TrEMBL record, chain A:
Span within the parent record: 344 to 392 of 587
Domain of life, per lineage: Viruses
Name of this protein: Major tail sheath protein
Organism (species): Staphylococcus phage 812
Amino acid sequence: VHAEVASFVKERSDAGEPMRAIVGGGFNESKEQLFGRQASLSNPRVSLV
Amino acid sequence: GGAYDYTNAIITDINQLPDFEAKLSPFGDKNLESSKLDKIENANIKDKA
């Protein structure tokens, strides 16, 4: 879902309509999960909590 | 040949695999290059850390 939201935000922004997203995963996530998810979510206009 | 300049890239990419796992040191912000790894082969690993 997070990759899709990143994709939707890119699709609207590249069309001239700027948009951004803030995202966070599950409960009590550990460091390894944050790095692995950041690497899988690397584009700008996206924030990870 | 890529992001594998930095040790982190091995730890993330292992964490993407089906059954292989890896975890970063709890001692601090090491983020060393792979270029300075030491010579070691055939480290027998499955039920170990």
